[PDB]
Amino acid sequence: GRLIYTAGGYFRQSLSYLEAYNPSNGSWLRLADLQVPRSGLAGCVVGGLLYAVGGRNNSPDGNTDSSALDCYNPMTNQWSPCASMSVPRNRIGVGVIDGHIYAVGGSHGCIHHSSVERYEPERDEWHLVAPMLTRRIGVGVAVLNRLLYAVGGFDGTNRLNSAECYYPERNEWRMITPMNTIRSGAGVCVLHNCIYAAGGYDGQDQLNSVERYDVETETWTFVAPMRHHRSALGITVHQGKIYVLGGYDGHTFLDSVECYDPDSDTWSEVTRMTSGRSGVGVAVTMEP
Ligand SMILES: O=C(O)c1cnn(-c2cccc(NS(=O)(=O)c3ccccc3)c2)c1C1CC1
């Protein structure tokens, strides 16, 4: 597309912001607020529509985990509710295959989900698929070659370095090589033939390290670390580069946006969000 959308997040409380960053000119635009504040959500795009999935409204007068799917049309600058998921999923991961949205893991109160469900926009309907082999919240999700990957997270007792892969035509999950780092609340995306995992929390510290999984060799390799340690970051890809947005560095809710160039193996600061926040949903689509 053309713009990087950041939706929701957390600073003091869950947020309703929708803001769009244009890498071509450095500008930010504030767009229509989410109908309900939410942090720990995920964003994705299907058919030029932006979707906000799951999360939690951490608010002065209560905390409510979200089963919501909400749809933002850039042409109209309007959010509309879509069909809700079977269960609330805070600290969710999502991935898109063949025009379908996969909602992965997340929490509902003390329940840590292994369940996974798939949304078909053409029918505005969710259906459960096979659950993961592991309960995962703060799970990173990516798609490569029409296979779905769930990476890291927290199973209710331990943060994880494990990862697994979903093969849709077999409706089956299989473990892949674990990462070399325990990561929960990392940013996970795909670039070229690799699954990247950036940042996260390992049980003791927020991380700046970044590693990538080559599906052909089944090995993880570290690349250059980010300039800022961060957990609960947003991540997306735009014209062959990775963008990481916000997060928590153990001291500050970051407004920093960093950009990774894989040809030079370097990170640089490219912009700042209008305010520091963590737990955003991020996706890329046309400008409004
Ligand atoms: O600790 C873990 O293992 C774990 C599992 N999922 N997430 C996760 C993932 C996404 C969002 C949030 N929430 S947030 O409101 O953005 C928030 C983050 C940091 C501090 C205060 C609020 C949390 C985490 C933490 C991030 C590390």
From Swiss-Prot:
Outcome after substituting R159M: Impaired interaction with NFE2L2/NRF2
Superkingdom as given in the UniProt entry: Eukaryota
Impact after mutating N58A: Impaired interaction with SQSTM1/p62
Disruption of the gene: reported phenotype: Early postnatal lethality caused by abnormal cornification. Mice survive until weaning and probably die from malnutrition resulting from hyperkeratosis in the esophagus and forestomach that cause gastric obstruction. Defects are caused by constitutive activation Nfe2l2/Nrf2, leading to constitutive expression of phase 2 detoxifying enzymes. Mice lacking both Nfe2l2/Nrf2 and Keap1 reverse the hyperkeratosis phenotype and are healthy and viable in normal conditions.
Site (Sensor for electrophilic agents): C110
Residues the record lists as S-cGMP-cysteine modifications: C110
Listed result of changing S39A: Impaired interaction with SQSTM1/p62
UniProt subcellular location: Cytoplasm; Nucleus
PTM notes: Non-enzymatic covalent modifications of reactive cysteines by electrophile metabolites inactivate the BCR(KEAP1) complex. Accumulation of fumarate promotes the formation of cysteine S-succination (S-(2-succinyl)cysteine), leading to inactivate the BCR(KEAP1) complex and promote NFE2L2/NRF2 nuclear accumulation and activation. Nitric oxide-dependent 8-Nitro-cGMP formation promotes cysteine guanylation (S-cGMP-cysteine), leading to NFE2L2/NRF2 nuclear accumulation and activation. Degraded via a proteasomal-independent process during selective autophagy: interaction with phosphorylated SQSTM1/p62 sequesters KEAP1 in inclusion bodies, leading to its degradation.
UniProt repeat feature Kelch, residue ranges: 3-48, 49-99, 100-146, 147-193, 195-240, 241-287
Effect ascribed to mutating Y10A: Impaired interaction with SQSTM1/p62
Outcome after substituting R159A: Does not affect interaction with SQSTM1/p62. Abolished interaction with SQSTM1/p62
Domain notes: The Kelch repeats mediate interaction with NFE2L2/NRF2, BPTF and PGAM5.
Functional summary from the UniProt entry: Substrate-specific adapter of a BCR (BTB-CUL3-RBX1) E3 ubiquitin ligase complex that regulates the response to oxidative stress by targeting NFE2L2/NRF2 for ubiquitination. KEAP1 acts as a key sensor of oxidative and electrophilic stress: in normal conditions, the BCR(KEAP1) complex mediates ubiquitination and degradation of NFE2L2/NRF2, a transcription factor regulating expression of many cytoprotective genes.
Subunit composition and interactions: Component of the BCR(KEAP1) E3 ubiquitin ligase complex, at least composed of 2 molecules of CUL3, 2 molecules of KEAP1, and RBX1. Interacts with NFE2L2/NRF2; the interaction is direct. Forms a ternary complex with NFE2L2/NRF2 and PGAM5. Interacts with (phosphorylated) SQSTM1/p62; the interaction is direct and inactivates the BCR(KEAP1) complex by sequestering it in inclusion bodies, promoting its degradation. Interacts with NFE2L1. Interacts with BPTF and PTMA. Interacts with MAP1LC3B. Interacts indirectly with ENC1. Interacts with SESN1 and SESN2. Interacts with HSP90AA1 and HSP90AB1.
Protein family membership: Belongs to the KEAP1 family.
The protein's name: Kelch-like ECH-associated protein 1
